[PDB]
């Protein structure tokens, strides 16, 4: 669970989504990729 | 498969079934390279050093590329009914290699109904070389 | 780094920062990164970008710098009351007006050059964007 104002994709399964005014970055099989804006 | 490459493909489907006029089914449902060699390398050893089955098997790649020869091609389009060509042959010994490779390690790709050039069936044809 | 080996006189005035550019187009090589905003470039930032871009070019091709800082900026020392003169030169600054180019590159292809210039863009205070070699 990072908090950053410069989000990114890293692997081939990074899915940028937008939930409740927040640009989240998530992944299927990676706990470290999980993010928040 | 551009314009200048489906032109070569319609050259292929004129001059490939103009002499040996057989089309059939094989697809990667037991597609693993060494398992694919049971059809591929054995057809290469049966032929010379030039074995070409090379496939473009689709629905709308049928009625546009075929229509010089054997216009019963409207039953190859959907359900992965594939494209296997033999440059020599007339219901030859290679016609049932797909049946042998389905009885031994394949999982019923598209029922291989022969595409009915002498009006064949899903079985070994009668006019087979013994 | 870069610095003048000789100035005629010691300390220069501030001036202002009006006008468009002069070195507008690519003049030597194939690829360029060009400033957009209005501002001021010190001696440290351009050589920091030089290392940060040489690290992506990996000693291939050739790169040209054209801007060279020569403005003797000063400082008044801390805890000294404002009178009693000017100050001593602390570093040497270049002036960059909107449109002026900084570096040029050849040899190494363009898709590498995207991120290879983006890294040196990310260490610079004014927004820059890429330009290509124009045949006239």
């Amino acid at each position: 669970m990072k908090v950053r104002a410069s989000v990114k994709k890293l692997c081939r399964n990074c899915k940028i989504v937008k939930r409740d005014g927040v640009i989240r970055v998530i992944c299927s099989a990676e706990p470290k990729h999980k993010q928040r804006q | 498969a551009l314009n200048l490459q489906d032109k070569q493909a319609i050259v292929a489907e004129v001059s490939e079934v103009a002499k040996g006029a057989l089309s059939a089914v094989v697809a990667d449902s037991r597609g693993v390279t060494v398992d694919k060699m049971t059809e591929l390398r054995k057809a290469g050893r049966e032929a010379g050093v030039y074995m070409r089955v090379v496939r473009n098997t689709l629905l709308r790649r049928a009625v546009e590329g075929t229509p010089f020869e054997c216009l019963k091609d409207a039953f190859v389009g959907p359900t992965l009914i594939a494209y296997s060509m033999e440059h020599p042959g007339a219901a030859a010994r290679l016609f049932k290699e797909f049946a042998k490779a389905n009885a031994k390690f394949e999982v019923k790709a598209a029922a291989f109904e022969g595409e009915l050039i002498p009006a064949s069936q899903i079985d070994r044809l009668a006019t087979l070389p013994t | 780094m870069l610095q003048p080996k000789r100035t005629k006189f010691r300390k220069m005035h501030k001036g202002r920062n009006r006008g468009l550019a002069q070195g507008t187009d690519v003049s030597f090589g194939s690829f360029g990164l060009k400033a957009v905003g209005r501002g001021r470039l010190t001696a440290r930032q351009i050589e920091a970008a030089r290392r940060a871009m040489t690290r992506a070019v990996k000693r291939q091709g050739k790169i040209w710098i054209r801007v060279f800082p020569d403005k003797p900026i000063t400082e008044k020392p801390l805890a000294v009351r404002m009178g009693k003169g000017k100050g001593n030169v602390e570093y040497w600054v270049a002036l960059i007006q909107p449109g002026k180019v900084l570096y040029e590159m050849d040899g190494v292809p363009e898709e590498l050059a995207r991120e290879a210039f983006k890294l040196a863009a990310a260490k610079l205070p004014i927004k820059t964007t890429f330009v290509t070699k124009t045949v006239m």
């Binding site: - | - | 468009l20 507008t24 400033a35 006239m136």
Partner: protein
């Protein structure tokens, strides 16, 4: 096959040419030889997709002005120093 469709400007100078620049156009000039300098406008984005080839600056251009397909070559070009645009072109009558 590179052609040019254009018409002639009404009022010349700075303040008129800035609005002509704003309205998807840009000035030009056609000089050389016997005919006087023709001061016309051009189309901006309809020649941006034509200046993307070197045959713009190495091939003949036919301009349709005054019902007269003038046969020109590219001479010199100016550009906005921090924009992907075109500003002002010369055209010699040759």
């Amino acid at each position: 096959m590179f052609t040019i469709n254009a018409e002639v400007r009404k009022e010349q100078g700075k303040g008129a040419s800035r609005r002509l620049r704003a309205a998807n156009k840009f000035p030009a000039i056609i000089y050389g030889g016997k005919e006087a300098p023709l001061a016309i406008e051009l189309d901006h984005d309809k020649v941006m997709n034509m200046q993307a080839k070197a045959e713009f600056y190495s091939e003949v251009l036919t301009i349709v002005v005054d019902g007269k397909e003038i046969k020109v070559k590219a001479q010199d070009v100016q550009r906005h120093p921090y924009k992907p645009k075109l500003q002002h072109i010369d055209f010699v009558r040759a």
